[PDB]
């Protein structure tokens, strides 16, 4: 089970694609919902995502069919296409997935943020860092639902520096474009969802607290946080979840004026990666960093909830720490940081102590020795 969210709000989920092309925006939306009696949301909604996942894991596509047998009917606890809870403007998180991931795999985070009164746009990237993604070749294909699939690109070592940087730059543009789409929907622009879904986008009119925007992301998505902040001042702060810093260009490090929070796992991090995070530091800039004791890279994504404890540890999906305990720490510390730097009038300051790593299961800063 993916956990249900700790906040007072019920949670809805839908998908938005606009336009229908490989250059349009594709996102999964999590939002405070009016109702709590809908079907739960299908977690991995297409067989081709399983084919993509099997390629990312270095197996034959036929392992994809076995993963689909084991996991293809798994749901996540969000009310599919539930009406948006009316009467309040909601702050906005744009969420960026990791390498080999896609938009639906960070529902534990997306659901928890939404249960606290956030709208969450989990983008699906078309830079070929997703395990799989889809789009429509033209208007005809979109009408009849003829999906074109785009699979993970594997790189030779000589391509790494250049291609990861091209990708992080496209990822930032995709975050900015997703922001402009949501803001235009908030400002009443008619948008026809390229997906035929029973959630009217007109509900979102006048529903965004338009100055309260953050970008959050895991791993490749953590580097996406930083590139996005340096390029788009509409984002007011960022939270990098176990950032993979390698994609970033040398130019970005001195160019991040917004508050930035690094939330790390204990076992993922390494000196080259920590050195790049420290390069973001400057006396005039707000920076915070914590490490979750006993945690692994996968504690930030939904695979940590997908299996039992023993299989979980073996597959490196779980750490020594309990998965619910770890994600509560990451989500609560995130809520307190967002309250501080977005100026929210909520009770998230009860977790201010966590921003400073003051908890038995937190390390302030990093366990990683550099120099
Ligand atoms: C969230 O995306 C991360 C971003 O960092 C990248 N990513 C993709 C797949 C993966 N890991 C992984 C997943 C699965 C899996 C696949 C489908 C359904 C359920 C599960 C559980 C299994 C069996 C094994 C897996 O890993 C085995 C090597 N350690 N990570
Ligand atoms: Cl790890
Ligand atoms: Cl290193």
DSSP string, 321-347: S-HHHHHHHHHHHHHHHHHHHHT--SS
Task: Tell me the CATH number at 285.
Answer: 3.40.50.1820
Give, as one character, the DSSP assignment of residue 225. Answer: H
Asked if 175 contacts 232 with a C-beta cutoff of 8 angstroms, the reply is yes
CA of 273 to the centre of ligand 3 (A): 7
DSSP three-state, residue 317? coil
Distance CA 321, CA 114 (A): 25
Place of tokens 């509560």: 328
321 lines ligand 1 (CB under 6 A): no
Contacts of residue 340, defined as CB under 8 A and 6 or more positions apart, other chains included, come to 259, 349, 352, 355
Based on C-alpha coordinates, what's the Rg of the chain? 19
| CA 311 to chain centroid | 25
Q: In this structure, are strands 208-218 and 90-96 parallel, antiparallel, or unpaired?
A: parallel
> Does an H or E element contain 92, and which?
strand 90-96
What is the position in ligand 1's atom list of the atom closest to the CA of 306? 21
| Structural domain count of the chain | 1
Taken as a whole, the chain contains a residue count of 371
Does 19 sit behind a cis peptide bond, omega within 30 degrees of 0 on the bond before it?
yes
Name the one residue in this structure whose structure tokens are 């250049």: 162
Stated as kind and residue range, the H or E segment containing 355 is: helix 352-355
How far is residue 318's CA from residue 316's CA, in Å, rounded to a whole number?
6
Burial (CB < 10 A; 0-12, 13-18, 19+), residue 163, is middle
- Report the separation in Å between the CA atom of 295 and the middle of ligand 2, taken as the mean of its atom positions: 8
Query: In angstroms, rounded to a whole number, what is the distance separating the alpha carbons of residues 161 and 233?
Result: 26
Resolution (A): 2.0
Asked if residue 56 has its Cβ within 6 Å of ligand 1, the reply is yes
For ligand 1, atom 1: residue with the closest CA: 101
Beta-strand pair 260-265/237-241: parallel
Residue reference for tokens 């949670």: 11
Reduce the DSSP state of residue 273 to 3 states and report it: helix
Shortest-distance atom of ligand 1 to CA 316: 29
Ligand 1 center to 303 CA (angstroms)? 6
CA 114 to chain centre: 13
Residue labelled with tokens 């508050």: 259
Tokens of 7: 């906040």
- Pair 267, 296: CB distance under 8 Å: yes
Atom of ligand 1 nearest to the CA of 100: 6
Is 336 in contact with 348 (CB distance < 8 Å)? yes
Q: Does the Cβ of 53 fall within 6 Å of ligand 1?
A: yes
CA angle 193, 198, 203 (to 5 degrees): 75
Nearest-ligand number for the alpha carbon of 369: 3
- Give the Å distance between the CA of 317 and the centre of ligand 2: 9
- The two tokens of residue 228 are 């996005």
Read off the tokens for 184.
Answer: 């235009």
Give the residue whose CA is nearest to atom 20 of ligand 1. Answer: 303
| Token pair for 5 | 């969210």
Q: What are the DSSP calls for 26-87, one per residue?
A: EEEEEEEES-S-SPEEESS--HHHHHHHHHHTTS-HHHHHHHHHHHTT-EEEEEETPPBPPS
Is the Cβ atom of 101 under 6 angstroms away from ligand 1? yes
The long-range contacts involving 235-239, CB below 8 angstroms and separated by at least 24 positions, are 235/94, 235/175, 235/179, 236/211, 236/212, 236/341, 236/342, 237/261, 237/286, 237/337, 237/338, 237/341, 237/342, 238/214, 239/214, 239/215, 239/263, 239/334, 239/337, 239/338
Task: Tell which residue, 46, 159, 108, 152, has the closest CA to residue 302.
Answer: 108
Element (H, E) at 68: helix 61-71
Instruction: Report d(CA 365, CA 359) in Å as an integer.
Output: 13
CA of 289 to the centre of ligand 3 (A): 18
Fill in the DSSP letter of residue 187.
T
Q: Is 241 in the pocket of ligand 1 (CB under 6 A)?
A: no
| Residue of minimum CA distance from atom 15 in ligand 1 | 303
The phi-psi region of residue 361 (left if phi > 0; otherwise alpha if psi is between -120 and 50; otherwise beta) is alpha
| Containing structural domain, residue 88 | 1-371
């Amino acid at each position: 089970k993916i956990p249900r969210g700790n906040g007072p709000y019920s949670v809805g989920c839908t998908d938005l694609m606009f336009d229908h092309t490989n250059k349009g925006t594709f996102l999964r939306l999590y939002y405070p919902s009016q109702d709590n009696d809908r079907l739960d949301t299908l977690w991995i909604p297409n067989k081709e995502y399983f084919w993509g996942l099997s390629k990312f894991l270095g197996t034959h596509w036929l392992m994809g069919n076995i993963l689909r047998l084991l996991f293809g009917s798994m749901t996540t606890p969000a009310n599919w296409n539930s009406p948006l809870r009316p009467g309040e403007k909601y702050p906005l998180v744009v969420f960026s997935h990791g390498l080999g991931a896609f938009r639906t795999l960070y529902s534990a985070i997306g659901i928890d943020l939404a249960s606290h009164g956030f709208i969450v746009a989990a983008v699906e990237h078309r830079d070929r860092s997703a395990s799989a993604t889809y789009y429509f070749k033209d208007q005809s294909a979109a009408e009849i639902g003829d999906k074109s699939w785009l699979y993970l690109r594997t790189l030779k070592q000589e391509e790494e520096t250049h291609i990861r940087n091209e990708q992080v730059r496209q990822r930032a543009k995709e975050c900015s474009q997703a922001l402009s789409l949501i803001l235009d929907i908030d400002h009443g622009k008619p948008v026809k969802n390229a997906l035929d879904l029973k959630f009217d986008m007109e509900q979102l009119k006048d529903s965004i607290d338009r100055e309260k925007i953050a970008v959050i992301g895991h791993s490749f998505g953590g580097a996406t946080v930083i590139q996005t902040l340096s390029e788009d001042q509409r984002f007011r702060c960022g939270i990098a979840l176990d950032a993979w810093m390698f994609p970033l260009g040398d130019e970005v490090y001195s160019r991040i004026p917004q508050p930035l929070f690094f939330i790390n796992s204990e076992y993922f991090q390494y000196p080259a990666n920590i050195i790049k995070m420290k390069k973001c530091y400057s006396p005039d800039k707000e920076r915070k960093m914590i490490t979750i004791r006993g945690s692994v890279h996968q504690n930030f994504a939904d695979f940590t909830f997908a299996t039992g404890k023993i299989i979980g540890h073996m597959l490196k999906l779980k750490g020594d720490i309990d998965s619910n305990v770890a994600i509560d720490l990451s989500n609560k510390a995130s809520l307190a940081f967002l309250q501080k730097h977005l100026g929210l009038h909520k009770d998230f300051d009860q977790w201010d102590c966590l921003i400073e790593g003051d908890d038995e299961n937190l390390i302030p800063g990093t366990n990683i020795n550099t120099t």
